[PDB]
């Protein structure tokens, strides 16, 4: 009991783009968004967190913990102290610990980007939230209802349990 | 009328880890194997797809434009000519075409990452063929049967259309 539907960038015969379909589950969150991105510097959606946000919407956020200082650098940059914000809370999530052969130990990245709306609608697929998926890349995206909805919903709250916060805060 | 199963790495509640499930449907192919990816350098899903060939199935590979002279260096070093075995073609895809800040011109990525199995049967996600997506990454994937098998099928298609013959060859 899933439907599932494709849309690329650039876009092929489809109305929207990726980007203004993500602007559209956006705008019409009622109780909760939860979002797990890898890169987020796309200064347009990140205002639509915000508006949500405003108008009582919770939203949770988790990032890729090597690449947070991107985020960080843009909501400072468009003069937004996002800590302040007590409807949005953004977390961290790493890869697996590994050892280096010169010894070092580090670790590695969380790979995985979806959009998770009222715990009803997801976004899933290659798209990061960043210009250079606007103006170089190709990639493509699933649009999902239905009974597979869960299944993002239990991995979402596996992955807030495993997220730390942000060493900056 | 779509199923759809999550597979995780590292591995949660299933039997099999994400690179023997891609063994497996390597193993089970009949006819024919498209494979879009963008890194390839895994050593022994390459001996799989190497020895389906060697049983008359026709496999297809695209692989990202920027990152192919890491697969063919890794088929040199396993002592394979790769060129030469008639029943695998290999091409490239770019991402768009594109200006930098200093106004050069550069193409991006194609960001997109699938195994489709005589024409019945995908593996999707965020898995990539190499080390790092074993040993130091989460990441996921979804096993797909039943319709939407058939846009994955189109898309391989017309990405087909789009490729070129390496330069390096
Ligand atoms: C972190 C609190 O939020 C959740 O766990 C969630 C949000 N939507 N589905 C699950
Ligand atoms: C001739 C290139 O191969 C295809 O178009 C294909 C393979 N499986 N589905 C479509």
Redesign the pocket.
């Known amino acids: 009991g899933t439907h599932i539907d494709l849309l690329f960038h650039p876009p092929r015969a489809h109305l929207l783009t990726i980007k203004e379909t993500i602007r559209k589950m956006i705008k019409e969150a009622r109780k909760?968004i939860?979002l797990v991105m890898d890169i987020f510097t796309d200064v347009d959606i990140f205002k639509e967190i915000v508006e949500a946000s405003t108008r009582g919407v919770?939203v949770?956020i988790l990032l890729d913990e090597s690449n947070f200082n991107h985020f960080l650098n843009m909501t400072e940059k468009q003069g937004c102290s996002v800590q302040r914000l007590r409807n949005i809370?953004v977390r961290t999530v790493k890869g697996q610990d590994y050892l280096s052969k010169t010894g070092a130990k580090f670790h590695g990245k969380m790979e995985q980007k979806f959009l998770?709306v009222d715990?009803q609608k997801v976004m899933y697929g290659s798209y990061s939230y960043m210009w250079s998926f606007e103006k170089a890349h190709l990639s493509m995206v699933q649009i999902i209802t239905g009974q597979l909805v869960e299944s993002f919903?239990e991995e979402?709250?596996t992955l807030?349990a495993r997220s730390c916060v942000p060493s900056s805060f």
Chains 1, 2 share one sequence.
């Open positions: 909760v939860a919770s949770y809370r998770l715990c919903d979402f709250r807030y």
